[PDB]
Amino acid sequence: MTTSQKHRDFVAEPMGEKPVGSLAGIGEVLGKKLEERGFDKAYVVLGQFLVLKKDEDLFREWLKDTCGANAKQSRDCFGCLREWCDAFL
Amino acid sequence: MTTSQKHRDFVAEPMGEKPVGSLAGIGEVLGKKLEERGFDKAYVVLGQFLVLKKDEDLFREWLKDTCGANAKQSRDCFGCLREWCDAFL
C-alpha cells in the first residue's frame, strides 16, 4: 500500500554506510538475520545485487532463502536497489 | 612509472557497462582470464570489491589467485577501484 518515504529517501541521496536494515523491504527483524549472515551494512548487500548481474529470479531466491523474506518484500528490494544503481551506477 | 590516462578517465566519469579489461591494472590477457571466471564486465568485478569490504589483503589474494596478476598490478586495481567508490559510493 504505497511505498514508504524511505524508498524515495534512499534513491534521492548516496547510501554511505547506512545499516542493512535501512534498505527498503528489510524490517528490523530481517535486518538482524542478514547481519548474522555477514551483511552488517547495506553496501555489502548492494554487492550481492551487483554479483547477480541484477538477475531478479536469482536475487529473490537469495533473499528469501537467506532470511525467509516474502515475495512482496523481495519486490521492494529489487526495484529499490535497481533504482539506486540507475542514479549512482 | 606514472599511471596511465585510463586511471584518471575511469574515476572521472561513471563506469557504465565498460568491459572488465577496462579496469586499470587488468591487461588484455588478464581480462580474458577474468572473463573465463565469469567477470565479463567491470561492475561484476566492482561487486567482488564491495563484498570484501574493501579489504586490501583479501582483494589482492583474490585477483592474484584468480588470474596470476603480479603485486604491482593488484596495487593499481585496489586504489583504482577504491577511488571510484570515493566519487560514486
Distances (CA, A) of A35 to A25, A29, A67, B62, B74: 15, 10, 10, 24, 30
**Closest CA–CA distance from residue B1 to any residue of chain A (Å):** 31
Q: CB of A12 within 8 Å of any CB in chain B? A: no
Nearest CB to B47: which of A14, A47, A88? A47
Q: List the grid coordinates of A4.
A: 514508504
Q: CB of B87 within 8 Å of any CB in chain A? A: no
Q: CB of A46 within 8 Å of any CB in chain B? A: yes
CATH class as words, domain A1-89: mainly alpha
Q: List the grid coordinates of B27.
A: 591487461
Task: List Cβ neighbours of A57 (8 Å cut-off, separation of 6 or more).
Answer: none
| Dist CA A11 CA A8 (whole Å) | 5
The domain spans of chain A are 1-89
| Dist CA A49 CA A66 (whole Å) | 14
Distances (CA, A) of B88 to A22, A41, A88, A89, B6: 19, 17, 6, 8, 17
- Reported as half-sphere exposure (CB side, CA atoms, 13 A), residue A7 has a value of 13
| Dist CA A45 CA A23 (whole Å) | 9
Residue B23: DSSP 8-state:
S
**Closest CA–CA distance from residue B53 to any residue of chain A (Å):** 7
| Dist CA A89 CA A85 (whole Å) | 4
Q: Do the beta carbons of residue A44 and residue B51 sit within 8 Å?
A: yes
Residue A52: DSSP 8-state:
T
Nearest CB to A44: which of B15, B46, B51? B51
Amino acid type, B41: K
Q: Do the beta carbons of residue B66 and residue B34 sit within 8 Å?
A: yes
- A12 backbone dihedrals φ, ψ, rounded to 5°: -110, -10
Name the one residue in this structure whose C-alpha cell is 589483503: B57
Q: Do the beta carbons of residue A21 and residue A77 sit within 8 Å?
A: no
3-state secondary structure of B1: coil
CB atoms within 10 A of CB B86: 9
B53 to chain A: nearest residue by CA? A44
Q: CB of B6 within 8 Å of any CB in chain A? A: no
